[PDB]
Structure 1
Amino acid sequence: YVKTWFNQPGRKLRRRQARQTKAAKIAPRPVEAIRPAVKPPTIRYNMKVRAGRGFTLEELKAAGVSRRVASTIGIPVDHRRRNRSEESLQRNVERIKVYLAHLIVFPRKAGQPKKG
C-alpha cells in the first residue's frame, strides 16, 4: 500500500478552479465566510490568537445581530463556544462591528398584498 503525489499540481488547480466557479455563482459576497478570533486551548499556544468556527450567541447579541439573520449575511454561529473572558467577547464583537461596517446589503423584493 503506497500513495504517490503526482496529482499534487492537478489537485491544486482543481481547487483554484473550484473557487472560481463559487465566485461566479455568488458575485458580490466573498468566497469565504468571516470567522472569529479565538485562542488555542492549551498552555503551549494559549497566548496565540487564531480563527474560530463561528460567533457565539453572546457575540451576536452584544454586537447587535439576531442569531437567525446572522446565518444569512454570512456570519456563522457556534452554539458550543462561550465567552468566559470579556477580552474574548471584546475581540469578537468588534470583529463583527468592523464587518458590518463594510457590508453592503442588497434589498430583496417583498410581497405586498393589496389588503392586510
Structure 2
Amino acid sequence: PKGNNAIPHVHQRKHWNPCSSQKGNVKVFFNQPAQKQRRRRLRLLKAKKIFPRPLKALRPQVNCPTVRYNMKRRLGRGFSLEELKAAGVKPRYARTIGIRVDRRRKNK
C-alpha cells in the first residue's frame, strides 16, 4: 500500500544503462585526479619554455550584467579600441607585448 509520499518524477526510462543489449549513455570521473596532475604538468612546462614571459596576458576589468550582479566586477576578454587610443598604444602592436585586445567592446 502506498501512503503519504511525494509523486516521484524520476526521469529514467531512456535506455541509459549498459547491458547485454544496450551500449548505454554514461559518464564517469575515474580520471579526475589523473587529469588534475596532467594539467599542472603542462602549465609548468609552458612556463619553462616561454620564460620570462608572463603566464597569462593582461585583461581589462568589466561590470557584470543584470540586476543580480550589478555590483560585481570581473575580468574581460580584451581591451577596447578607445582605451588603447587613450593610452597611446597601437592595437596590432599591443597584441605583440602580451595585451589582449577586443574589437567589440563599447565603453559606454
Structure-2-length-normalised TM-score: 0.74
RMSD: 0.9
Matches within 5 A, 1:70-109: 70-84=94-108
Q: Which runs of 5+ in 2 are unaligned?
A: 1-24
Q: Which runs of 4+ in 1 moved over 6 A?
A: none
Structure 1 residue 3 displacement after superposition: 1.0
Structure 1 residue 52 displacement after superposition: 0.1
- CA distance, structure 1, for counterparts of residue 46 and residue 99 of structure 2: 18
CA offsets 1:41-90 (integer angstroms, 9 cap, x no match): 21110211000000010111112211111100000111011101xxxxxx
Could you say which residue in structure 2 is the equivalent of 1:54? 78
Could you say which residue in structure 2 is the equivalent of 1:24? 48
How many residues align structurally?
84
Identity %: 64
2:58 to 34, 46, 50: 34
Q: Which runs of 5+ in 1 are unaligned?
A: 85-116
Structure 1 residue 19 displacement after superposition: 0.6
Structure with greater helix share of residues:
1
Higher-Rg member (1/2):
2
